[PDB]
Amino acid sequence: DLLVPKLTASVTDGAVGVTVDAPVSVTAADGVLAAVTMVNDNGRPVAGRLSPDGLRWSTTEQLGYNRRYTLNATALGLGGAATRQLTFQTSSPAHLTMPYVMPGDGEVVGVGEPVAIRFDENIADRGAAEKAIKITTNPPVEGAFYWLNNREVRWRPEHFWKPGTAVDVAVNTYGVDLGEGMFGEDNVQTHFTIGDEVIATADDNTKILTVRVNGEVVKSMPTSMGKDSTPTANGIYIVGSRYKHIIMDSSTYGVPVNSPNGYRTDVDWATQISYSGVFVHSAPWSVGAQGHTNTSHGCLNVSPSNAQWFYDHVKRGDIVEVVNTVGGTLPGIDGLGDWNIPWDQWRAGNAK
Numbered sequence: 562d563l564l565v566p567k568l569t570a571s572v573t574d575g576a577v578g579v580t581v582d583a584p585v586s587v588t589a590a591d592g593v594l595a596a597v598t599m600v601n602d603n604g605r606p607v608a609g610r611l612s613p614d615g616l617r618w619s620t621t622e623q624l625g626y627n628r629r630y631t632l633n634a635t636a637l638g639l640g641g642a643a644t645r646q647l648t649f650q651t652s653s654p655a656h657l658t659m660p661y662v663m664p665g666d667g668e669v670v671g672v673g674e675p676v677a678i679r680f681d682e683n684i685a686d687r688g689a690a691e692k693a694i695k696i697t698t699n700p701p702v703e704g705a706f707y708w709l710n711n712r713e714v715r716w717r718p719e720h721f722w723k724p725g726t727a728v729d730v731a732v733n734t735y736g737v738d739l740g741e742g743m744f745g746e747d748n749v750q751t752h753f754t755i756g757d758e759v760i761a762t763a764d765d766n767t768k769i770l771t772v773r774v775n776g777e778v779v780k781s782m783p784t785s786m787g788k789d790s791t792p793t794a795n796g797i798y799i800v801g802s803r804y805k806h807i808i809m810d811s812s813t814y815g816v817p818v819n820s821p822n823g824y825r826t827d828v829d830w831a832t833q834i835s836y837s838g839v840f841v842h843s844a845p846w847s848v849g850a851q852g853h854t855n856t857s858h859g860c861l862n863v864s865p866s867n868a869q870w871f872y873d874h875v876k877r878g879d880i881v882e883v884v885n886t887v888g889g890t891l892p893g894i895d896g897l898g899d900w901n902i903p904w905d906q907w908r909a910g911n912a913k
């Protein structure tokens with residue numbers, strides 16, 4: 562009794578809402594695939610690949626949103642032939658959101674650097690976004706997702722990264738329903754490495770900014786932080802971008818320039834450590850106060866040479882800690898204040 566070949570697809574005829582996050586495949590049993598074609602509505606063929614043993618065919622390029630595909634396959638065996646025709650329709654998004662992932666590919670960053678995925682649209686289903694984001698670490702370490710706002714989610718370990726750790730971030734959002742008819746416009750894939758442990762502590766009691774590289778004190782900077790009425794917040798800051806020079810505009814951070822606490826200052830050697838506008842930068846005008854008295858709007862004022870030193874030796878992801886000021890604590894959702902959120906609260910997340 563010779564068997565008739567059987568044709569099994571990873572879709573079914575008449576299917577709709579087929580998600581394009583995965584390839585479409587066809588399998589033969591009691592025979593081999595002699596012919597497999599898939600065309601879109603317009604008759605344009607889709608690239609596919611047949612396995613050497615002739616048993617498995619799969620698409621090999623991206624499938625498009627909002628499309629009607631037609632699949633034709635024929636299987637031959639000693640028992641005879643069999644042909645099937647399947648038509649199906651893929652997801653038809655109401656909205657598309659593009660993801661952006663920091664830090665940059667190939668980059669080497671500090672031990673406080675979180676994984677950041679920012680979407681250009683509000684994410685209705687955060688849980689679906691988190692699931693779609695595949696993070697790999699080496700050596701392996703536990704981490705968790707937490708949302709700073711409706712568009713950006715962060716991933717980080719309980720403690721600072723171990724130097725030498727590889728991080729791989731695969732944002733596989735294409736074809737994924739992120740909620741309310743919003744699907745990922747594309748995928749992104751970044752990889753980066755954890756460099757040396759650089760931790761700079763600013764103690765308001767001593768007015769000193771001590772830089773420690775892998776435990777070792779390598780630089781001690783007299784500093785002037787925020788004057789009482791505009792104090793520098795205590796807490797953990799993540800180093801962000803660095804500038805040879807930059808015009809600091811208080812309106813950029815919510816405070817009108819023409820205000821009592823406003824300002825517009827052109828400074829040298831500026832290292833940003835909070836979205837709220839905290840910078841380590843060159844403050845020549847206050848070199849007398851540094852190490853003695855706080856006089857700034859909130860920045861860590863240091864000498865020109867120490868500012869340039871900081872610029873040259875501190876990198877994105879390195880850590881600045883402020884302690885014992887008269888300020889409060891840096892908001893966990895500052896954008897660079899991730900570490901100020903307790904692990905239990907971060908691990909619990911906020912996907913809802």
Ligand SMILES: *C(=O)CC(=O)[C@@H](C)CC(=O)C(=O)O
Nearest residue numbers: 838839840856857858859860
């Ligand atoms: C950063 O937030 C701005 C500052 O705190 C420094 C530039 C200090 C300052 O504004 C000043 O008046 O010297």
